[PDB]
Symmetry: D2
Subunit: 259 residues, 4 copies
């Protein structure tokens, strides 16, 4: 029971392929009690969440909706019971419009699209922390999902810029979370899975993603989300108690090897 | 004549203390022909720019105005003459509303404010490169101003997030600029220069810089930073792009 | 039982304050079966190791002794039993002579001293991996102790150079270890604990750590670091290799 | 005249292909007065150095020879004249025995070989600074050659570890050099140029080296040392006056791009 008795909020479950779905599954298997969120279409999200090992309250959260943010802590408290607080929070919501990510030239993304992406992918990490830290226990852990943006790459374009901004936001969130005895960290995952993108972009992406398994000293299996879900659970646990403002790489070691 | 015969656009001149003012001054001393940009307060900008060593056209540019951007190359070409292109572009226009930077708690910055800051401080780097690459010469150089955002610091708050975003933007700009034979780099400067708390915090931050810097850091002197930018505008760093050059007295290399 | 059924070799236990002592303690509490190494002073080492929660074989290992290295796997196999392999290896053996670390000016360290330090602190990481990989199980984990050398600091001097070298070594070890399904990672710890100058310098360094760390840093408590090592020894970081995990209270993420 | 009137010591000239040869050539073209060093075989090194644009004293320097180090400043002073000091020093000596670099497995390099490599490639940066800082002018510049060791790579093996150690040494040298108003920096160059290595290693190296031109947004021409020589001259000049303990990349921007 790695997370026995811990209460964890998990955002970002959209399908049973979502990385958040696997995080939730592994966390329940390890004894956690979960609270889940969804932006919209909650009857649809409930159908997916019913397939987790155990029941979990589902709460509405559109991170661009100020009222949802303002009521969130109260609604969680009602879900988990007065006097109870959260031990963990998982942010697995990243979004960039297609104009900012994919086939579109980098210069052709209008700022309104980039700003929406940054709002959902990076600013919301702070918004969630603001809402939830007042109901988190000392020793608790906020974990966000990242994809290493240290170097530019084809196609990821402004989503890479959004991840760069998330990395910086995480460092500031850690300062605020520290006042509660709470850690804030990101997990930088390898790619988890182009005909839709067309031939050029699809080949470029496939090369990019396959370099990962080539570089990773222990390999990288893009079809298996479990190693990333386990890492997140490690950070949610008591076993990384001195790590905050940081990035943990769940990428097969690929980012440490040039070729 | 480090920049003899180069035509260079310089944004961000607001006072004669602005870093862009010194960059302009030094570039003119080294033989560059400049074009300057401003948003609004053009009478006040003209008075300042009159203190530079040589004349330079002033053009209007609000980076949030899509029409300014869409007309900018044409307006630059008219200023420098048809058949002439730019060799350099300097982006020195960072901004964050006070809700995102200073005394305001990090969590109390609304997104509208942050988004404005990121627009002006980071996205505009890309917008200016989109507008100006088609009128730049091969061997040219685009340089933006940074303040190392690798670690969180008190008070700089969301402006540090904006500089993180700018660093990422620079790497993508480099890819685009490369197609024109143009380099894109940032210069990460040391600090150049209320209430008791914020004032003490900022003073401690600024004092630690000179302490850590192996060659010292003089916050009152922008010249070393201006020289560094002119180095990146020259032909002497011809294989450096998508990158960050630190003009900070080596402070970022030292722990204590 | 985080490490239930795992067999783990732990080097570097010298006193009951040693970080390796706590790593051993915590790993035993979490169900691991340990093998311990020491060089010399074995009577003194046995007394310390008797204070651990459970018994563990002690083996001789001077990492500069090629014969110890060449016999080490066989000696480990004899200790754990034929048909059993290791799941984990902990390297906690840094050393630099005083000429390279402390009060001595950086330039006054002779190379013979530095080279000894690098041998023990960095090369031995590779030597131990060479010796022990052939008797490790897939899914295993090799962990070494680091102290973030990304920036220069007073007094740590050539020991910081040695840790830089160790970080590079770790990335190459990872490549080799991968062929066996084994991970290789370092844990960069915060400081765990003469004359006036050196004493003040070291105190300032140590005090700044707790100030910068968003969750604080208690230099008197090795447990958080020991837990982190045990996390890397477990099955819960199964995709992390060639890497550095910081157990420093987040201090390295914060400027002031 | 970028370096007009500057006195610069340049180590590492072995052939007219050496990067130090190009640095020296470009520095002379820009008005510098040079002092050159060689380990051994000075009549041979003189033949190469005679092909530079201008005459330059050649002094003996084996960086593993303590006596050479102890006499070096005096011998330079005699070469450049009493009262004169150096404005610049270029360290372009890197060496690793074949057991540490190339075909040999990483684990098969004996420490005696690794230590010799680290002595020549990394410790000597400090030894040279120790000898020469007492005869360097404020505003001066010590520059070493680097090859980015942030990530592991095939074949470079322990030479990458030596460069990692050099990077750390540079940060400490900068502290000491700062007391004289002198800067210390490294230039991380792209690869400048496998049948000898055999088929596997030769293919691996060729792929590694060719990825560079693919990733570099402005390209990378491995046959042209001039862009690297110019960068070094930039750091030797007055135009990077606030940069120390640092690494400047002359690599076509390759290290900033993933694919």
């Amino acid at each position: 029971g790695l997370l026995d008795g811990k209460r964890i909020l998990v955002s970002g479950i959209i399908t049973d392929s979502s990385i958040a779905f696997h995080i939730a599954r592994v966390a329940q298997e390890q004894g956690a009690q979960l609270v889940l969120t969804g932006f919209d279409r909650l009857r649809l999200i409930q159908r997916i969440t019913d397939r987790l090992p155990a029941k979990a309250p589902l709460l509405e959260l559109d991170v661009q909706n100020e009222e949802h943010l303002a009521s969130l802590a109260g609604r969680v408290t009602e879900a988990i019971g007065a006097g109870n607080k959260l031990d963990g929070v998982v942010h697995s919501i990243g979004f960039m419009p297609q104009t900012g990510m994919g086939i579109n030239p980098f210069f052709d993304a209008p700022y309104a699209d980039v700003s929406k992406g940054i709002h959902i992918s990076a600013y919301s990490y702070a918004s969630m922390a603001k809402a939830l830290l007042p109901i988190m226990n000392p020793g608790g852990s906020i974990v966000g999902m990242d994809f290493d943006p240290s170097r530019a790459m084809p196609a990821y374009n402004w989503m890479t810029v959004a991840k760069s901004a998330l990395e910086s936001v995480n460092r500031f969130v850690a300062r605020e979370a520290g006042k509660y005895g709470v850690r804030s960290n990101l997990v930088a995952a390898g790619p988890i899975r182009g005909g839709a993108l067309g031939e050029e972009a699809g080949a470029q992406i496939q090369l990019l993603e396959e370099g990962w398994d080539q570089r990773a000293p222990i390999g990288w299996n893009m079809k298996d989300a479990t190693p990333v879900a386990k890492t997140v659970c490690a950070l949610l646990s008591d076993w990384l108690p001195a790590t905050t403002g940081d990035i943990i790489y769940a990428d097969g070691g690929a980012h440490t090897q040039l070729l």
